[PDB]
Amino acid sequence: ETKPRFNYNAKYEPQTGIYHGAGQDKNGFQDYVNAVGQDKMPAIYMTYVNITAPVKRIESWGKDLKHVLDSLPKGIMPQIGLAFTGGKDTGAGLDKEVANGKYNAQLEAFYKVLLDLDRPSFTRIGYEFEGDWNGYSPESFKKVFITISKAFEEKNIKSATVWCSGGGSANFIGLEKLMAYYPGNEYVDWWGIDVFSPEEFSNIGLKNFFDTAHTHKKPVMIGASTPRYVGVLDGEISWNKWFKPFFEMLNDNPGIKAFCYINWDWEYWSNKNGFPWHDWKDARIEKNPFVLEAYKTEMENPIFIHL
Ligand SMILES: O[C@@H]1[C@@H](O)[C@H](O[C@@H]2[C@@H](O)[C@H](O[C@@H]3CO[C@@H](O)[C@H](O)[C@H]3O)OC[C@H]2O)OC[C@H]1O
């Protein structure tokens, strides 16, 4: 019942399967891998960097990322959420400033990290680009995306660009509004969408998003996902509310070629990081035997590409 995948021949797009990804901190990733099994190690590791931070924070982010990756098995692909926000979900978009060159020094530090990493990766440039909490504006967002996409190309950087929608969290805006943020097929390697609340699975906006990704001839990555407002601690109830439709969505949409599951205690990270996820519930699959076993079982589906 897993539909054979479509192939668009995009950069780092697998021919037949779905990349297994997880995040989004070092120890949460290792806990998740120990729960699902070392033979089901994700091909994709989630990470994040804000290009408006000081150059030194870009450099330390890069150094820590290489440290983490080189202590994991060879071949893991970093999946980088690149932000340019001036506050923590306060609508403080800095895309105009980036578009005007005020952060070129940070961009150069970013390019240098990817060049030193010298390995296949993904960059979600300005991920969840239409979310009000990021506060980006369409014309400057596109100019930033095109600039980074062209720099990747010109430097032969080993990273696929990902144009990643906030989906239901941004109220599934119409296609005309989405396209205001679209830089054009020539600059975009993959589409992405992030899937959180369980009602999103049945929203017609989600199907419409897959429909137009397919006719832009782009594979879709689930750029981030977690059982928001569900968690894992209710066993079969948790599974049926979120995980069951989640894996149905992967099965039913042939253009989905990667997924990224966030294995987090959101209440902990909300207090630690200062972001508003306090009521998102506990998403650590290892904290519930039913969910862990059911999830491990889904990862045994041959469609999924581990390692
Ligand atoms: O600084 C980053 C955060 O930006 C990052 O956020 C991700 C993102 O995928 C998303 O963001 C929320 C979407 O729903 C809105 O209602 C919330 O306001 C957003 O914060 O979900 C949370 C994270 O997965 O997290 C990592 C941080 O380092």
| Residue-by-residue DSSP string for 185-197 | GGG-SEEEEEE-S
**How many angstroms does the Cα of residue 122 sit away from the middle of ligand 1?**
17
Q: Which atom of ligand 1 is nearest to the CA of 275?
A: 20
Q: Residue 249 belongs to a domain with what CATH number?
A: 3.20.20.80
- 292 part of a folded domain: yes
Nearest CA to ligand 1 atom 26: 48
Number of other CB atoms surrounding residue 305 within 10 Å: 17
Domain assignment present for residue 13? The answer is no
Query: For residue 89, which atom of ligand 1 is closest to its CA?
Result: 18
Ligand 1 centre distance from Cα of residue 154 (Å) = 30
Say how far apart CA 280 and CA 231 lie, in whole Å.
7
Q: Looking at the domain assignment, is residue 8 inside a domain?
A: no
Q: Is residue 158 part of a domain?
A: yes
Taking the alpha carbons of 126, 132, 134, 136 in that order, is the dihedral positive or negative?
A: positive
Domain span at residue 258 reads: 18-305
Name the experimental technique. Answer: X-ray
* Phi-psi category of residue 68: left, alpha or beta, with phi > 0 → left and psi -120 to 50 → alpha: alpha
Q: Is residue 147 part of a domain?
A: yes
**Are the C-beta atoms of 276 and 23 separated by less than 8 Å?**
no
Residue 2 belongs to a domain: no
The number of folded domains in the chain is: 1
Residue with the smallest CA separation from ligand 1 atom 28 is 48
By alpha-carbon position, which residue is closest to atom 13 of ligand 1? Answer: 169
> Does the residue 10 lie in any domain?
no
How far is the C-alpha of 55 from the C-alpha of 61, rounded, in Å? 10
Residue 239 DSSP code: I
20 burial (CB, 10 Å; 0-12 / 13-18 / 19+) is: buried
Expressed in Å, this structure's resolution amounts to 1.9
d(CA 304, CA 42): 9
Asked if the structure places residue 80 within a domain, the reply is yes
Please give the Cα distance from 103 to 90 (Å, whole number): 20
